[PDB]
Scaffold this motif. Structure first.
Motif, mmCIF file in Angstrom:
data_model
loop_
_atom_site.group_PDB
_atom_site.id
_atom_site.type_symbol
_atom_site.label_atom_id
_atom_site.label_comp_id
_atom_site.label_asym_id
_atom_site.label_seq_id
_atom_site.Cartn_x
_atom_site.Cartn_y
_atom_site.Cartn_z
ATOM 1 N N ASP A 6 -0.154 -6.690 6.019
ATOM 2 C CA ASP A 6 -0.574 -8.086 5.368
ATOM 3 C C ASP A 6 0.183 -9.043 6.003
ATOM 4 O OD1 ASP A 6 1.905 -7.638 3.948
ATOM 5 O OD2 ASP A 6 1.075 -7.607 1.895
ATOM 6 N N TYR A 7 0.450 -10.397 5.238
ATOM 7 C CA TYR A 7 1.004 -11.344 5.886
ATOM 8 C C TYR A 7 2.645 -11.287 5.877
ATOM 9 C CZ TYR A 7 2.175 -16.146 6.665
ATOM 10 O OH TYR A 7 2.386 -17.561 7.471
ATOM 11 N N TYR A 8 2.875 -10.313 4.747
ATOM 12 C CA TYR A 8 4.339 -10.187 4.520
ATOM 13 C C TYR A 8 4.687 -8.743 5.123
ATOM 14 C CZ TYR A 8 4.970 -14.249 1.766
ATOM 15 O OH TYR A 8 4.847 -15.583 1.377
ATOM 16 N N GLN A 9 3.737 -8.242 6.220
ATOM 17 C CA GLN A 9 4.199 -6.934 6.944
ATOM 18 C C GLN A 9 4.215 -5.738 6.098
ATOM 19 O OE1 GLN A 9 4.254 -8.859 9.970
ATOM 20 N NE2 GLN A 9 2.889 -7.405 10.597
ATOM 21 N N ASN A 10 3.441 -5.773 4.962
ATOM 22 C CA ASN A 10 3.482 -4.289 3.987
ATOM 23 C C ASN A 10 2.041 -3.887 4.267
ATOM 24 O OD1 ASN A 10 5.585 -5.454 1.819
ATOM 25 N ND2 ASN A 10 4.062 -6.927 1.582
ATOM 26 N N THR A 11 2.193 -2.517 4.323
ATOM 27 C CA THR A 11 0.825 -1.517 4.656
ATOM 28 C C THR A 11 -0.275 -1.811 3.646
ATOM 29 O OG1 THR A 11 2.338 -0.295 5.980
ATOM 30 C CG2 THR A 11 0.305 0.713 5.400
ATOM 31 N N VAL A 12 -1.465 -2.115 4.018
ATOM 32 C CA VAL A 12 -2.656 -2.109 3.246
ATOM 33 C C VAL A 12 -3.585 -1.226 3.652
ATOM 34 C CG1 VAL A 12 -4.666 -3.980 2.672
ATOM 35 C CG2 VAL A 12 -2.261 -4.639 2.984
ATOM 36 N N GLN A 13 -4.089 -0.497 2.669
ATOM 37 C CA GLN A 13 -5.156 0.468 2.644
ATOM 38 C C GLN A 13 -6.439 0.015 2.091
ATOM 39 O OE1 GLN A 13 -2.841 3.965 1.227
ATOM 40 N NE2 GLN A 13 -3.110 4.965 3.089
ATOM 41 N N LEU A 14 -7.721 -0.020 3.063
ATOM 42 C CA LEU A 14 -8.455 -0.985 2.530
ATOM 43 C C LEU A 14 -9.916 0.356 2.592
ATOM 44 C CD1 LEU A 14 -10.295 -3.476 1.551
ATOM 45 C CD2 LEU A 14 -10.505 -3.942 4.004
ATOM 46 N N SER A 15 -10.850 0.321 1.497
ATOM 47 C CA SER A 15 -11.918 1.305 1.332
ATOM 48 C C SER A 15 -12.994 0.245 0.843
ATOM 49 C CB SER A 15 -11.466 2.294 1.006
ATOM 50 O OG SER A 15 -12.612 3.292 0.851
ATOM 51 N N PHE A 16 -14.282 0.771 0.876
ATOM 52 C CA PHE A 16 -15.398 0.239 0.425
ATOM 53 C C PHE A 16 -16.368 1.178 -0.593
ATOM 54 C CE2 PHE A 16 -14.235 -2.818 3.521
ATOM 55 C CZ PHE A 16 -14.291 -4.010 2.857
ATOM 56 N N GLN A 85 -12.040 -1.752 -2.688
ATOM 57 C CA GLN A 85 -10.810 -1.445 -3.361
ATOM 58 C C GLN A 85 -9.691 -1.660 -2.120
ATOM 59 O OE1 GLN A 85 -9.220 2.203 -5.215
ATOM 60 N NE2 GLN A 85 -9.471 1.106 -7.242
ATOM 61 N N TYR A 86 -8.458 -1.988 -2.544
ATOM 62 C CA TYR A 86 -7.419 -1.934 -1.567
ATOM 63 C C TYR A 86 -6.176 -1.629 -2.129
ATOM 64 C CZ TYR A 86 -6.112 -6.908 -1.812
ATOM 65 O OH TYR A 86 -5.809 -8.169 -2.473
ATOM 66 N N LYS A 87 -5.194 -0.933 -1.386
ATOM 67 C CA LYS A 87 -3.854 -0.486 -2.255
ATOM 68 C C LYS A 87 -2.858 -1.141 -1.075
ATOM 69 C CE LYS A 87 -2.657 4.005 -2.888
ATOM 70 N NZ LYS A 87 -2.349 5.323 -2.232
ATOM 71 N N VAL A 88 -1.798 -1.938 -1.527
ATOM 72 C CA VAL A 88 -0.673 -2.640 -0.864
ATOM 73 C C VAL A 88 0.571 -1.865 -1.311
ATOM 74 C CG1 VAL A 88 0.592 -4.673 -0.249
ATOM 75 C CG2 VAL A 88 -1.833 -4.944 -1.039
ATOM 76 N N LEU A 89 1.009 -1.285 -0.182
ATOM 77 C CA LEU A 89 2.130 -0.566 -0.171
ATOM 78 C C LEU A 89 3.487 -1.373 0.291
ATOM 79 C CD1 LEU A 89 0.229 1.752 1.264
ATOM 80 C CD2 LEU A 89 2.002 3.172 0.290
ATOM 81 N N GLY A 90 4.308 -1.814 -0.874
ATOM 82 C CA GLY A 90 5.246 -2.815 -0.609
ATOM 83 C C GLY A 90 6.539 -2.102 -1.053
ATOM 84 N N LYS A 91 7.777 -2.849 -1.359
ATOM 85 C CA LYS A 91 9.193 -2.365 -1.530
ATOM 86 C C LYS A 91 9.199 -2.151 -3.009
ATOM 87 C CE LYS A 91 12.808 -4.977 0.097
ATOM 88 N NZ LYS A 91 13.672 -6.037 0.024
ATOM 89 N N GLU A 92 9.175 -2.673 -4.120
ATOM 90 C CA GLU A 92 9.225 -2.580 -5.520
ATOM 91 C C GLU A 92 8.387 -1.601 -5.864
ATOM 92 O OE1 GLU A 92 8.337 -6.770 -5.423
ATOM 93 O OE2 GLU A 92 7.185 -5.531 -4.174
ATOM 94 N N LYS A 93 6.893 -2.001 -5.780
ATOM 95 C CA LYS A 93 5.622 -1.040 -6.310
ATOM 96 C C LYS A 93 4.575 -1.144 -5.495
ATOM 97 C CE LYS A 93 5.969 -4.272 -10.011
ATOM 98 N NZ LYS A 93 5.805 -4.593 -11.524
ATOM 99 N N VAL A 94 3.688 -0.199 -5.612
ATOM 100 C CA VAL A 94 2.140 -0.180 -4.929
ATOM 101 C C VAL A 94 1.291 -0.799 -6.044
ATOM 102 C CG1 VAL A 94 2.826 1.684 -3.302
ATOM 103 C CG2 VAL A 94 1.510 2.111 -5.396
#
Length: 158
Positions: A6-16, A85-94
């Motif tokens: 993403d914009y803040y370099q977090n891993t994004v998992q996207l699916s349709f 649907q998409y999943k954002v894998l960040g620091k504090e929580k997904v």
């Protein structure tokens, strides 16, 4: 299935596919179309973005999507369709976000737009989204161009 940053370099998992990451997503994102124009909102901090919000108590993702559109643009949805649907894998929580497409029937007057400056209409989205300082960071990654292409391929837009 798409995996990128993403914009803040977090891993994004996207699916349709129909909710592959979680059957209980906590957030929603609504790509709005009012006729031949894109319906967006202007977040007081972030800037120009498509309507979205958190799934509140006793609400399902579809109800949260309809509410987010009303709370941020004052609009009524003619047809709400699940896109992906998409999943954002960040620091504090997904965070698991459901992507919806909303065909806008009408735009009504609202007393309070919440943490937004109200509805914003674009005939077509600008080319330099990533470099446009007026736009939100949630519009600045691949989630948007991939979702717009799938929306164009689905045959829902005109």
């Amino acid at each position: 299935m798409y995996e990128f940053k993403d914009y803040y370099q977090n891993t994004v998992q996207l699916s349709f596919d129909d909710q592959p990451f979680s059957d209980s997503p906590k957030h929603v994102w609504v790509i709005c179309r009012f006729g031949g124009k894109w319906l967006l909102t202007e977040h007081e901090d972030r800037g120009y973005e498509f309507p979205g919000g958190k799934v509140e108590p006793m609400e399902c993702a579809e109800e949260a999507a309809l509410r987010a559109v009303k709370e941020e643009t004052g609009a009524r949805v003619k047809s709400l369709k699940y896109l992906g649907q998409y999943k954002v894998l960040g620091k504090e929580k997904v965070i698991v976000k459901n992507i919806y497409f909303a065909d806008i029937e009408k735009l009504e007057k609202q007393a309070d737009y919440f943490e937004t400056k109200g509805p914003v209409l674009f005939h077509e989205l600008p080319e330099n989204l990533s470099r446009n300082k007026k736009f939100s960071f949630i519009m600045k990654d691949s989630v948007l161009p991939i979702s717009l292409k799938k929306l164009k391929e689905s045959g829902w837009i005109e």
